Amino acid sequence: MIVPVRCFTCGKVLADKYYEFKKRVEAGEDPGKVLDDLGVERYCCRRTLLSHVELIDQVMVYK
């Protein structure tokens, strides 16, 4: 279900850094460094992007 817009604990913008995160890791670039290159300070806000599932790419193909 499309990246929890913003964050939960750290409640700042994070959705806007979804695509480039994924795509940067989808080349072999370790996520724990990719995140660093982006606005990912604390781990609480980092978790929200780390352990996400994007189930939506299943649900749309319906109604």
């Binding site: 499309i2 990246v3 817009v5 913008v13 959705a15 806007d16 979804y18 749309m60 193909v61």
Partner: peptide
């Protein structure tokens, strides 16, 4: 403030 925030995918 940020125009790049994903809202919802439309089919």
């Amino acid at each position: 403030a940020n125009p790049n925030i994903p809202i919802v995918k439309l089919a």
